Amino acid sequence: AQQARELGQSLAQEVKAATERLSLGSRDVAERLRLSKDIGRLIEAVETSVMPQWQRRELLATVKMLQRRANTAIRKLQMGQAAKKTQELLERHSKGPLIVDTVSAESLSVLVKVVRQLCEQAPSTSVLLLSPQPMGKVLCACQVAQGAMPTFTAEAWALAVCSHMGGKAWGSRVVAQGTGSTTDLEAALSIAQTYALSQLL
């Protein structure tokens, strides 16, 4: 009873600290993700915690706000880094029919955002990108232009790509993503561009 109320008060104080941290925000995306996870776990604990109902649900309101602004913030920061790298690749490539290259990324979400921005700004171009990860792992994301032939499907594209790397692929005809592991990146890049060109007839 009293102990539960005290714990709830501590949680609220903790909640206040978390909110302050959020206002402050964090430069590292990883720390932003960690904060969102702390929000989810904390809300789950409050859900089954013992305390007066009014305070419990009032705090639930505050913390749900905290999660919305936290997740919105992390999504914005990923959009920022993805935009910067997207411009970095835009400066040196021509808007050809097909652009197949590699870009350094920290997570697959950011890579996907790069592909979507790139296709949004170059509508008549199909895109595939690979990201090297430590310890030999490799990520893949690709998107096919809407104007492109329907015979060209992204899922089969990344399907062959990761299929050569022994990985896995998933998506739809328009967008696809996958994982693999291979020493030579130019082999996967060459297979992707070869296949895609073979379809683009």
Residues 6+ apart with CB under 8 A from 60: 43, 46, 47
As a dihedral over the C-alpha atoms of residue 104, residue 92, residue 200, residue 102, rounded to 10 degrees, the angle is: -10
Measured distance CA(111)–CA(107) in Å, rounded: 7
Backbone angles phi, psi at 169, to 5 degrees: -140, 145
Question: C-alpha angle 39/41/43, rounded to 5°?
Answer: 65
Measured distance CA(170)–CA(142) in Å, rounded: 11
Residue 191, CA atoms < 13 Å, CB-side half-sphere: 17
Contact 110, 83 (CB under 8 A): no
| Structure-determination approach | X-ray
Using CA of residue 175, residue 125, residue 101, residue 85, what is the dihedral sign?
negative
Measured distance CA(124)–CA(59) in Å, rounded: 49
DSSP 143: E
DSSP 171: E
Using CA of residue 36, residue 177, residue 185, residue 115, what is the dihedral sign?
negative
Measured distance CA(201)–CA(132) in Å, rounded: 30
Resolution value, angstrom units? 4.1
The token pair at 80 is 């920022």
Contact 103, 85 (CB under 8 A): yes
Residues 6+ apart with CB under 8 A from 6: none
Measured distance CA(6)–CA(182) in Å, rounded: 55
Residue whose entry in the numeric block shows the structure tokens 């492109």: 148
Question: C-alpha angle 48/55/32, rounded to 5°?
Answer: 70
